[PDB]
Each structure stands twice: as C-alpha cells, then as structure tokens.
C-alpha cells in the first residue's frame, strides 16, 4: 500500500526526496504500517 | 529570556545578499555543501 506517499517503495523514497524533504515520508509509512499490524494483531488476539 | 542551557556557540561570516536564504538545514546550495552545513537536528537563530 502507499498511505498517500508519492512511492508505496521505501527505496524509491530515499532517492529522490535525499533525508531532508523524504523524512515525511518515512514518518507516514511507518505510522501506517504500524496501524495495519496493529489491527492484526488485535484481529489475532480476538480469534485466539 | 527564560531558558538555560549548557553551552552556547556563535558563528560568524560573510555572504552575499541573494544567498542569505541557503542558511537552513535540509537547503541544497554550493553554500550549504561546500561553505556552511546545518545538521538536520538542528535548533538555533539566524541573524544577517
């Protein structure tokens, strides 16, 4: 998924927006990838 | 006028007029990489 970067690849996020204007960036894929596993785990939890 | 802090460091220089703006973390100019470079964890005052 993407979570309204300008590249769902990390790789391609750190070449062309360099530390300084990407950090964003990495700041929204990582909240969301941390919410999707967040749910899974919950979703884990309850079936267990 | 009503902080502390352990240690406080001043620079000084000369620049043109025009290039007063290339003095920011994160700025891309010959300036910012080959005179002057601001960390990008950076905190601090910028007087011209």
Known sequence: ?48 | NDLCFTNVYADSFVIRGDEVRQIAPGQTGKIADYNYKLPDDFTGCVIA
């Open chain 1, 1 to 48: 998924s993407n979570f309204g970067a300008i590249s769902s690849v990390l790789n391609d996020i750190l070449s062309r927006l360099d530390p300084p204007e990407a950090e964003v960036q990495i700041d929204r894929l990582i909240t969301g990838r941390l919410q999707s596993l967040q749910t899974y785990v919950t979703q884990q939890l309850i079936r267990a």
